[PDB]
Structure 1
Amino acid sequence: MSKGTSSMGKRQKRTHAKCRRCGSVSFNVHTKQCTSCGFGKTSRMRTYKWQAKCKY
């Protein structure tokens, strides 16, 4: 259908479930990883230095 409100009626599925380790709704049900804390990918918790300004 149209790219606007006509194709937004098929919006009945879900792509992210709820994570066990952090409780945030960011668990990818296809790749089986949490996109916020990294659960499923690793035993460590996801942190990147680009999640904040260079502190200078």
Structure 2
Amino acid sequence: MSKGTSSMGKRQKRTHAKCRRCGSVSFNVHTKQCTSCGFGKTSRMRTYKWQAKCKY
């Protein structure tokens, strides 16, 4: 058995579900937090200054 195509047929399950707040498939099913908008962790939307570049 290998790490390539042999063990990639075990991908019959999910770790991210479609989040309510943003409709993106980023809601982790174990931590209960969307990794795109942060629903289930915070009221505000997660946005960081490293998501774009320094404006200079």
With normalisation by structure 2, the TM-score equals 0.97
- Percent of aligned pairs with the same residue? 100
Higher helix residue share:
2
User: Structure 1 stretches of 5 or more lacking a match?
Assistant: none
Q: Deviations over 1:9-54 (max 9, x none)?
A: 1110000000100000000000000000000000000000001110
In 2: Cα distance, 1:48 partner to 1:40 partner: 17
Q: Which residue of structure 2 lines up, in the alignment, with residue 42 of structure 1?
A: 42
- The total of aligned residue pairs comes to 56
In 2: Cα distance, 1:23 partner to 1:7 partner: 30
Q: Which runs of 4+ in 1 moved over 3 A?
A: none
Q: Which residue of structure 1 lines up, in the alignment, with residue 23 of structure 2?
A: 23
Let me know the Cα RMSD of the aligned residues: 0.5
User: Structure 2 stretches of 5 or more lacking a match?
Assistant: none
With normalisation by structure 1, the TM-score equals 0.97
